Ligand SMILES: NC(=O)c1ccc[n+]([C@@H]2O[C@H](COP(=O)([O-])OP(=O)(O)OC[C@H]3O[C@@H](n4cnc5c(N)ncnc54)[C@H](OP(=O)(O)O)[C@@H]3O)[C@@H](O)[C@H]2O)c1
């Protein structure tokens with residue numbers, strides 16, 4: 734299975750200055766739950782943003798840099814390499830990866846951040862005409878998690 738995993742706001746902002754615009758611990762828990770024991774494919778910038786591979790899953794980085802050889806990370810140099818990766822593969826970002834893969838993935842696990850943030854990077858437009866809502870779950874709010882959010886699982890029609 735090939736899936737997108739993304740958090741985007743009401744206007745599809747995903748990033749600002751190479752980091753997330755929001756602090757939302759519950760989204761990171763969501764990411765952990767979905768992708769632990771599976772595979773993440775990310776662009777070079779996204780990788781450099783996190784700074785180290787995420788534990789307990791396969792981390793794959795897409796880059797043109799032939800000098801890229803980082804401990805605990807597998808490197809790929811083509812989109813076509815994604816299709817040779819075994820198991821459940823999550824396209825993990827950033828904007829460039831999402832743009833390249835939205836037409837190719839089986840489904841999407843989206844966290845809709847129900848606010849409007851300043852962004853410099855965006856998830857591409859999509860329409861529910863093309864995507865069935867497999868589930869929609871409101872995120873629980875508390876002292877640590879104060880931005881309303883909804884976890885959507887969309888499956889291509
Ligand atoms: N909210 C979210 O769900 C989420 C998730 C992840 C990231 N983000 C945000 O997204 C933003 C980063 O997105 P971005 O588009 O600037 O960067 P990115 O997608 O993370 O990385 C772009 C880099 O990926 C490599 N790449 C992409 N496609 C390639 C291809 N076909 N062949 C070879 N290399 C390829 C290139 O690396 P080289 O230049 O080294 O060749 C390219 O410069 C940040 O703000 C980050 O915080 C948000």
Ligand SMILES: CCOc1ccc(Br)cc1-c1cc2nc(N)nc(N)c2cc1C
Pocket residue numbers: 738739740751752753760761764779782783824825826843844
């Ligand atoms: C690039 C900035 O994003 C982060 C920085 C630190 C940590 Br720790 C996780 C993220 C992060 C959260 C994310 N959340 C969702 N729902 N989806 C993603 N594809 C995603 C990707 C990253 C990389």
